[PDB]
């Protein structure tokens, strides 16, 4: 019961703090209370020329930005994999089930954690060293600016819920341990693990937020929302694959977007 | 000179992760570890005795052949777990993305299994249940087709492989080289896996020079054995496809389903 759920929430939070360089706490402190502002080609060039900062050969500004996004995503996938391994029953699954869960869960988790570094106006990059304006990303030629804006739209609404890192750790864990993923082998184990994570989250939310009896179902709804946000992203990704043939696709992201 | 240390790492991972070594298997198979011997399984009655606590402590089945096939599946799942831990105790394997790790295990475990099987096989049968039992080759031949057809080529491979006289320290490197194969379909970082495999093969060549000084060619014979194992597994998978097609009452463990997919 309780105190089992308290200890579980604490363990999950500790692994989250162990594995994610940027926390919402740190990010909010940067966004208030300074990072190099990237809002046009000139400031981007300054950032790249030592100021803020491995990539495939240069093609153009929009593809360069797309490449930096891919590199960020690969790094966050590595961190999410280490995080999930520290989740108690995750490592008892067969390695292929672990991979299946990561494959279908990382982008939902990435978009959820993105809100931690987003506000109305832009987002932190390079571990908080830079801040890229939403306006600049809107200015990229597109299908490339189309790809990014729905993430802001999701993030500002998600940040209205005012979660903290301790809540998020459980939220991300529940996203990875999802019983619905196609090709999953031990559906009952994964569902039981998720059930424990979500029960811990309901407890943890009570002990944190005024009431939070409405927040929990809203979070469950956000997980559903994350699913099809990723679906839309994948469609955009596929057509970027179809039409932007000079744009190289990182191999891990190719494997993930496969199917 | 570093190759000696690399070999040592890999041997340590092997001794740490495999329940059965060849040293132990040979001592059991030549009556040097017990007053007489492991319990012999050669008919339906001795199989029932063995399962009555004596050797062991399964899905729905209707006949002896399928029962034995289910025991084979259980052994294979356990060995896949052991090979997975062994490969992870190789740091450069663990530096790969998890999906590349799974790809290498998926296409390498059966080659590795068939090689390690030679360690517990002789002319007359094989050790089961971590050496508590010995199931006779003749009993396995008495199973109906296609189950007796699938097992016998493993014996034919094993007898020839044991003629090479490898020890556990050679096998540890051989198995590592089987798993770290740059050829596997869908592999993501082919060059990194190839560099690892090359290091393993250099360590193995060195180790064979040091361990088998009158090695009549032993390293090329082992490379050929790797090709042979690939052909053995191809034929095994064809037989499995025929069992999937024609023995529809016979269930396949989910992990083996995933491995055999495609
Ligand atoms: C999953 C995903 C997330 C995001 C959100 N995001 C990041 O995380 C990092 N970043 C960003 C933007 C501009 C710069 C600068 F160079 F201008 F400074 C540096 C970093 C950004 O916009 C964007 C895309 C396209 C995604 O899609 C890909 C990656 C293809 C995927 O599917 O993995
Ligand atoms: C990979 C493989 C290896 C082998 C070789 N072998 C074992 O390992 C264990 N054993 C055995 C034989 C008889 C008994 C007893 F019941 F009589 F006690 C107990 C164990 C045996 O004969 C056999 C088959 C069909 C294999 O193929 C499957 C499993 C489908 C696969 O592809 O994984
Ligand atoms: C399709 C690929 C099948 C072979 C992948 C090997 C599966 C073994 O994977 C292992 O299984 C254990 C559960 O028994 C887990 O504890 C381990 O973390 C995992 O590495
Ligand atoms: C097919 C979908 C792929 C999603 C899972 C990829 C997870 C990355 O995998 C991780 O990457 C590291 C690479 O440095 C290895 O050290 C880690 O052992 C591994 O867990």
User: Where does residue A102 rank: exposed (0-12), middle (13-18), buried (19+ CB within 10 A)?
Assistant: buried
Residues 6+ apart with CB under 8 A from B49: B39
Nearest to B131 by CA among B237, B247, B18: B18
What residues pair up with A37 in beta bridges, in sequence order?
A131
Q: Which residue of B lies nearest to A103 if distances are taken between CA atoms?
A: B99
Using a CB-CB distance cutoff of 8 angstroms, which residues of chain A are in contact with residue B102?
Answer: 95-96, 99
Show the 3-state SS of chain A: CCCHHHHHHHHHHHHHHHHCCCCHHHHHHHHCCCCEEECCHHHHHHHHHHHCCCCCCCCCHHHHHHHHHHHHHHHHHHHHHHHHHCCCCHHHCCHHHHHHHHHHHHHHHHHHHHHHHEECCEEEECCCCEEEEHHHHHCCCCCHHHHHHHHHHHHHHHHCCCCCHHHHHHHHHHHHCCCCCCCCCCHHHHHHHHHHHHHHHHHHHHCCCCCCCCHHHHHHHHHHHHHHHHHHHHHHHHHHHHHCCCCCCCHHHHHHHCC
Query: Which residue shows structure tokens 């998890």?
Result: B98
Q: Does A94 touch chain B (CB under 8 A)?
A: yes
> What is the atom index within ligand 2 of the atom nearest the CA of B150?
25
- Alpha carbon distances (Å) from A101 to A174, A192, A206: 11, 14, 28
Angle among Cα B154, B46, B110 to the nearest 5 degrees reads 20
* The pair of three-digit structure tokens given for residue A181, joined into one six-digit string: 């993923």
- Alpha carbon distances (Å) from B94 to A120, B103, B190: 40, 13, 15
Judge contact between B114 and B233, C-beta under 8 A.
yes
Q: Does A145 touch chain B (CB under 8 A)?
A: no
Measured CA to CA, the distance from residue B135 to residue A54 in angstroms comes to 56
Characterize the bridge pairing of strands B121-122 and B125-128: antiparallel
Q: In what order do the strands lie in the sheet with A130-133?
A: A36-38, A130-133, A122-125, A118-119
CA A184 vs. chain centroid, Å, equals 22
Using a CB-CB distance cutoff of 8 angstroms, which residues of chain B are in contact with residue A92?
Answer: none
Cross-chain residue pair A185–B106, CB shorter than 8 Å: no
CA of A72 from ligand 3 middle (Å) equals 28
Strands (E), B55-176: 121-122, 125-128, 133-136
Of A95, A103, A255, the CB nearest to B84: A95
Judge contact between B20 and B120, C-beta under 8 A.
yes
Measured CA to CA, the distance from residue A10 to residue A152 in angstroms comes to 30
Measured CA to CA, the distance from residue B169 to residue B12 in angstroms comes to 9
Coil/strand/helix, residue B72? helix
Angle among Cα B180, B157, B14 to the nearest 5 degrees reads 40
* The pair of three-digit structure tokens given for residue B235, joined into one six-digit string: 């034929």
Of the bound ligands, which one is closest to the alpha carbon of residue B113?
Answer: 2
Nearest to B9 by CA among B78, B117, B87: B87
Minimum CA distance residue for ligand 2 atom 1: B76
Minimum CA distance residue for ligand 4 atom 11: B97
Phi, psi values for residue A241, rounded to 5°: -55, -40
Write down the experimental method used for this entry. Answer: X-ray
Q: Which residue of B lies nearest to A250 if distances are taken between CA atoms?
A: B188
Cross-chain residue pair B99–A185, CB shorter than 8 Å: no
Of the bound ligands, which one is closest to the alpha carbon of residue B261?
Answer: 3
> What is the atom index within ligand 2 of the atom nearest the CA of B79?
8
- Alpha carbon distances (Å) from B246 to B84, B151, B152, B237, B249: 31, 17, 20, 14, 9
Backbone dihedral region of A252: left (phi > 0), alpha (psi from -120 to 50 degrees) or beta?
Answer: alpha
Coil/strand/helix, residue B39? strand
Measured CA to CA, the distance from residue B110 to residue B101 in angstroms comes to 15
Using a CB-CB distance cutoff of 8 angstroms, which residues of chain A are in contact with residue B255?
Answer: 94, 96, 185
Q: Which residues of A130-159 are buried (b: 16+ CB within 10 A; e: fewer)?
A: bbbbbebbeebeebbbebbeebbebbeebb
Residue B31 has a CB neighbour count (10 Å cut-off) of 11
CA of B57 from ligand 3 middle (Å) equals 24
Minimum CA distance residue for ligand 2 atom 9: B72
Measured CA to CA, the distance from residue B133 to residue B258 in angstroms comes to 29
Angle among Cα A162, A164, A168 to the nearest 5 degrees reads 105
Give the resolution to one decimal, in Å.
2.1
What residues pair up with B127 in beta bridges, in sequence order?
B134
CA of B121 from ligand 1 middle (Å) equals 56
Judge contact between B37 and B134, C-beta under 8 A.
yes
Q: Which of A75, A96, A99, A101 to mutate to test the interface with B (most CBs of B within 10 A)?
A: A96
Q: Does A81 touch chain B (CB under 8 A)?
A: yes
* Residue A247 CA neighbour count, 13 Å, CB half: 24
Q: Does A95 touch chain B (CB under 8 A)?
A: yes
Q: Does A54 touch chain B (CB under 8 A)?
A: no
Measured CA to CA, the distance from residue B170 to residue A228 in angstroms comes to 52
Q: Does A98 touch chain B (CB under 8 A)?
A: yes
Query: Which residue shows structure tokens 């940067």?
Result: A30
């Amino acid at each position: 019961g309780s105190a089992d759920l308290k200890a579980f929430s604490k363990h999950i939070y500790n692994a989250y703090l162990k594995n994610f360089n940027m926390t919402k706490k740190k990010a909010r402190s940067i966004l208030t209370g300074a990072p190099f502002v990237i809002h046009d080609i000139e400031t981007l060039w300054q950032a790249e020329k030592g100021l803020v900062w491995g990539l495939p050969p240069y093609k153009e500004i929009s593809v360069h930005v797309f490449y930096r996004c891919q590199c960020t995503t690969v790094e966050t996938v590595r961190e999410l994999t280490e995080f999930a391994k520290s989740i108690p029953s995750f490592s008892s699954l067969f390695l292929n089930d672990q991979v299946t869960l990561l494959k279908y869960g990382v982008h939902e988790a990435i978009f959820a954690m993105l809100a931690s570094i987003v506000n109305k106006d832009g987002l932190l990059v390079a571990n908080g060293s830079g801040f890229v304006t939403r306006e600049f990303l809107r200015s990229l030629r597109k299908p490339f600016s189309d790809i990014i804006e729905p993430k802001f739209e999701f993030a500002v609404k998600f940040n209205a819920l005012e979660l903290d890192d301790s809540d998020l750790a459980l939220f991300i864990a529940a996203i990875i341990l999802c019983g619905d993923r196609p090709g999953l082998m031990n559906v009952p184990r994964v569902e039981a693990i998720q059930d424990t994570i979500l029960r811990a989250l309901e407890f943890h939310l009570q002990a944190n937020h005024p009431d939070a009896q409405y927040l929990f179902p809203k979070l469950l709804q956000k997980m559903a929302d994350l699913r099809q946000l990723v679906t839309e992203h994948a469609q955009m990704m596929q057509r970027i694959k179809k039409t932007e043939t000079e744009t190289s696709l990182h191999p891990l992201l190719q494997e993930i977007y496969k199917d």
